[PDB]
Design an enzyme around this catalytic site. Sequence first.
Site, short mmCIF file in Angstrom:
data_model
loop_
_atom_site.label_atom_id
_atom_site.label_comp_id
_atom_site.label_asym_id
_atom_site.label_seq_id
_atom_site.Cartn_x
_atom_site.Cartn_y
_atom_site.Cartn_z
N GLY A 114 -11.78 -0.38 -1.78
CA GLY A 114 -10.57 0.39 -1.93
C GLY A 114 -10.41 1.35 -0.77
N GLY A 115 -10.97 0.97 0.38
CA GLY A 115 -10.83 1.78 1.59
C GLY A 115 -11.36 3.19 1.48
CB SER A 196 -13.47 -4.01 0.74
OG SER A 196 -12.51 -3.68 1.71
CD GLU A 323 -12.51 -10.68 4.69
OE1 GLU A 323 -11.81 -9.78 4.16
OE2 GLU A 323 -13.59 -11.11 4.23
CG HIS A 436 -9.84 -7.64 2.36
ND1 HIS A 436 -11.09 -7.63 2.94
CD2 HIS A 436 -9.72 -6.47 1.70
CE1 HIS A 436 -11.70 -6.49 2.66
NE2 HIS A 436 -10.88 -5.77 1.91
C1 LIG Z 1 -10.91 -1.75 4.74
O1 LIG Z 1 -10.24 -1.68 3.49
C2 LIG Z 1 -9.17 -0.75 3.44
C3 LIG Z 1 -9.14 0.35 4.34
C4 LIG Z 1 -8.07 1.28 4.27
C5 LIG Z 1 -7.03 1.10 3.31
C6 LIG Z 1 -7.05 0.00 2.40
C7 LIG Z 1 -5.85 -0.16 1.34
N1 LIG Z 1 -4.49 -0.56 1.95
C8 LIG Z 1 -3.80 -1.58 1.11
C9 LIG Z 1 -4.71 -2.75 0.91
C10 LIG Z 1 -4.12 -4.11 1.34
C11 LIG Z 1 -4.86 -5.26 0.62
C12 LIG Z 1 -6.07 -5.79 1.15
C13 LIG Z 1 -6.76 -6.84 0.48
C14 LIG Z 1 -6.26 -7.37 -0.76
C15 LIG Z 1 -5.07 -6.87 -1.32
C16 LIG Z 1 -4.40 -5.82 -0.63
F1 LIG Z 1 -3.24 -5.36 -1.22
C17 LIG Z 1 -3.59 0.62 2.19
C18 LIG Z 1 -2.39 0.34 3.18
C19 LIG Z 1 -1.37 0.84 2.08
C20 LIG Z 1 -2.53 0.86 1.01
C21 LIG Z 1 -8.14 -0.94 2.48
O2 LIG Z 1 -8.16 -2.03 1.56
C22 LIG Z 1 -8.91 -1.79 0.35
C23 LIG Z 1 -8.85 -2.99 -0.60
C24 LIG Z 1 -10.02 -3.72 -0.94
C25 LIG Z 1 -9.95 -4.83 -1.80
C26 LIG Z 1 -8.72 -5.21 -2.35
C27 LIG Z 1 -7.54 -4.50 -2.04
C28 LIG Z 1 -7.60 -3.39 -1.17
#
Ligand SMILES: COc1cccc(CN(CCCc2ccccc2F)C2CCC2)c1OCc1ccccc1
Length: 527
Positions: A114-115, A196, A323, A436
Site C-alpha cells: 500500500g505504498g 509491494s 508490474e 501489480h
Molecule cells: C510501490 O507501491 C506504491 C507506492 C506509492 C503509492 C501506491 C498507491 N497508488 C495507487 C496504486 C495503483 C495500483 C497498483 C497496483 C494494483 C492496483 C492499483 F490500483 C497511489 C497513486 C494514487 C494512489 C503504491 O501502490 C500500492 C499498492 C500495492 C498493491 C495493490 C495496490 C496498490
Amino acid sequence: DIIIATKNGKVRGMQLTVFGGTVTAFLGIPYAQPPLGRLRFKKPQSLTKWSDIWNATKYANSCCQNIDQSFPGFHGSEMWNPNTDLSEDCLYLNVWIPAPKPKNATVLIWIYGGGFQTGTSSLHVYDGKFLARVERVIVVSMNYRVGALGFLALPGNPEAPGNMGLFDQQLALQWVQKNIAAFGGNPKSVTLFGESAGAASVSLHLLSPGSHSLFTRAILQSGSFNAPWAVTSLYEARNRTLNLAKLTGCSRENETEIIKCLRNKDPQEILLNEAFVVPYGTPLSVNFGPTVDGDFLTDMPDILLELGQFKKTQILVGVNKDEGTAFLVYGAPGFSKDNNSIITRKEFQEGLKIFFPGVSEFGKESILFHYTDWVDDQRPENYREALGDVVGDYNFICPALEFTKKFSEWGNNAFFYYFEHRSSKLPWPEWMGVMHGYEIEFVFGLPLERRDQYTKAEEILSRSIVKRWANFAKYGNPQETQNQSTSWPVFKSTEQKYLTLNTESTRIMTKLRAQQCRFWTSFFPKV
Ligand SMILES: COc1cccc(CN(CCCc2ccccc2F)C2CCC2)c1OCc1ccccc1
Ligand SMILES: *[C@@H]1O[C@H](CO[C@@H]2O[C@@H](C)[C@@H](O)[C@@H](O)[C@@H]2O)[C@@H](O[C@@H]2O[C@H](CO)[C@@H](O)[C@H](O)[C@H]2NC(C)=O)[C@H](O)[C@H]1NC(C)=O
Ligand SMILES: *[C@@H]1O[C@H](CO[C@@H]2O[C@@H](C)[C@@H](O)[C@@H](O)[C@@H]2O)[C@@H](O[C@@H]2O[C@H](CO)[C@@H](O)[C@H](O)[C@H]2NC(C)=O)[C@H](O)[C@H]1NC(C)=O
Ligand SMILES: *[C@@H]1O[C@H](CO[C@@H]2O[C@@H](C)[C@@H](O)[C@@H](O)[C@@H]2O)[C@@H](O)[C@H](O)[C@H]1NC(C)=O
Ligand SMILES: *[C@@H]1O[C@H](CO[C@@H]2O[C@@H](C)[C@@H](O)[C@@H](O)[C@@H]2O)[C@@H](O)[C@H](O)[C@H]1NC(C)=O
Ligand SMILES: CC(=O)N[C@H]1[C@H]([C@H](O)[C@H](O)CO)O[C@@](O)(C(=O)O)C[C@@H]1O
Ligand SMILES: *[C@@H]1O[C@H](CO)[C@@H](O)[C@H](O)[C@H]1NC(C)=O
Ligand SMILES: *[C@@H]1O[C@H](CO)[C@@H](O)[C@H](O)[C@H]1NC(C)=O
C-alpha cells in the site's frame, strides 16, 4: 467455543467453514497500546493485561489513510481500499489456526503493501482461512500505521523517531513469538511474507537486528527495500516533516513543540496535507516511508545489503509480468483503463515527466533511448507498453532482481519467480496485463474456492503456488514434490535461474530483464 489464553489475557475466536472443514479465526487481537494522544507518532507501547475474554470475532479498525478515489465504484481500485473504519486505534492482528488445532504449525505472517501510505490486513485478498485449511499453517496478519502517522521522521527524536509502522510490524512479530505457541504454532518456524511495500517491509526486517530473532524465512512479492520508492532519505524526511508542519501551521523552532502541535491536529488534517509535502509527486510517491532512523535501521540499507549485513536465511522473491501498468492510469497522459491507451511518442515523453519529475532532460532521454529500440516501429502499442515496462522495471523488477542477486551472494538459497498469469476475473483491461498486486489472490488460495468464477486452470495454479509457498515456509524449499512439477532451482548470481508461474507451462528461464536492468541498476543511478 474456542478460547485461547494469551500472555495478556483470553481471546475468543470464531469457527469458519472452509472446504468441507473448519478454520478457527481470531480477528482483531490488539497487540499494542492504541497510539493515541501523547502516543501518536511514538513507537508502539506495550499492551496492558486484560482479565475479560477479548472477543476477537471481527476485523478491527484499519489505520488512518487516504483512500484511492480515482475510480469510485470500480472494484479494480476499490478492492484495495480499507474495508473497516479508519482509526488511529488500529494496532491489531489476526490469526487463522487450522482445525483441529495444530501441534507445532509453521506460521505465516503477512505484511500488506500500500505504498506505506495505505493498506489493511482485513482485505478480502488477504484472507488467511484458505492457507490454514489447505496447508495446516497458521496465518497471521497485522495492521501497522501508514503515512505520516506511521513514518513521520524527526531523526533521533522519540516523539517522531521514524519507522513507527515498521516497529508496529515488529511488535506484532514479537506477539507471535510470545503467543503463537498457545494457538498451536511454532515460533521457531515463522515465515514473513508481504507484497509491494509489504515486501519492502519484509526485506527491511531481514536487515533490522531487532527483527532477526522474530522470524525464520522471508517471502518478497513485488517489492524490496532497494526499490526507489522504498526508503525516504533522512534529507527528504526532514523537508517533508517540516512541510507538513508549515501546511498545518505547526512550524516551531523547538522540534518537539512541532510534534506536540501535530498531536492536536485531527487525523484528517494530517491526511489532507500529506500529498503536498513533496513539490512534485508521482503515482508511486511514498511521501512518508521508511527512513534510516538509527533504531530499526542503523545505516543506509543499500550499504547493509552490499556488505552482507542481514539475517542469513532463505528468501523467496518474485515479481509480476506487468508490474508497471497499474500506475499509468493514475497520471500518465493519454492513458485510461476504459480504452486501449495507445499513446504517441510525445505522450510517452510527457509520461516520463510524470514518473521522473525531478530527473534531468538527459536522464529522461536516456530512458526513452533504452526503451524505444522497437522490434517493430509501426506497432501502435510500442509506446504504451514501453512506459509500462519503464515503470515496472525501475520500480519493481530490477530492484527485486538486484536484491536477490546481492542477498544470494552471501551463500543463502534464494528462489525467484516471475508471475505471468492474468487473473481471469481481473477487472482492469487486458492491455494492463499481469498487474501489480494480482498474484496475491493466488498466493492466498482464493481460486481454490470453486464457487468464485475462477477457471479450473487458475485453481490448479493457486493450489501449486500455495503448496510451493507452504513448503517454503515449512522447509525453506518452494517445491511441489508430488504432481510431477517443474523443480524450482535456487537463484545463483551466476546463472540467475528463475521460475515462471502460469497456467500453461511452468518453465525455468535465466536472467530476467537482463538488458533492461543493466540500464536501471548500473547506469541510471548515476543521472
Ligand atoms: C510501490 O507501491 C506504491 C507506492 C506509492 C503509492 C501506491 C498507491 N497508488 C495507487 C496504486 C495503483 C495500483 C497498483 C497496483 C494494483 C492496483 C492499483 F490500483 C497511489 C497513486 C494514487 C494512489 C503504491 O501502490 C500500492 C499498492 C500495492 C498493491 C495493490 C495496490 C496498490
Ligand atoms: C523542500 O520544501 C520546499 C518547500 O515546499 C513548499 O512548501 C510546502 C509547504 C508544500 O506546499 C510544497 O508543495 C512547496 O513546494 C520546496 O520549495 C518549493 O519548491 C517549488 C518547486 O521546486 C517552488 O515552486 C516553491 O515555491 C518552493 N517553496 C519554498 C517555500 O521554497 C523544496 O523544493 C523542497 N526540496 C526538495 C528537494 O524537494
Ligand atoms: C483514452 O482515454 C483518455 C482519457 O480521457 C477520458 O477517457 C476516455 C475513455 C473518454 O471518455 C474521454 O472523453 C475522457 O476525457 C484520452 O485522453 C484524453 O484525450 C483528449 C484528446 O486527446 C485530451 O484532450 C485529454 O487531455 C486526455 N486526457 C487524459 C487524462 O489523458 C485518450 O485520448 C483516449 N485514447 C484512446 C486511444 O482511446
Ligand atoms: C463476547 O461474546 C460473548 C459470547 O457471545 C458470542 O457473541 C455473539 C455476538 C454471538 O456470536 C454468540 O453466539 C457468541 O457466543 C458475549 O456473551 C459477551 O457479552 C461478549 N463480550 C464483550 C465484551 O463483547
Ligand atoms: C516444536 O518444534 C521445535 C523445533 O522447530 C524446528 O526447527 C525450525 C527451524 C522449523 O523449520 C520447524 O519446522 C522445526 O520443527 C522444537 O524445538 C519444539 O520443542 C517443538 N515444540 C512442540 C510443542 O512441538
Ligand atoms: C471505529 C469504531 O470504533 N467502531 C466500533 C463499532 C461502530 O462504531 C458501531 O457499529 C457504530 O458505527 O461498534 C463496536 O461497538 C462493534 O460494533 O463492535 C466497536 C467498534 O470498534
Ligand atoms: C522543547 O520543549 C520541551 C517541552 O517539554 C522541553 O522538554 C525540551 O527540553 C525543549 N527543547 C528545546 C531545545 O527547547
Ligand atoms: C496434486 O494432485 C492431486 C490429485 O492427484 C490433487 O488432489 C492435489 O490437490 C494436487 N496438489 C497440488 C499441490 O497441485
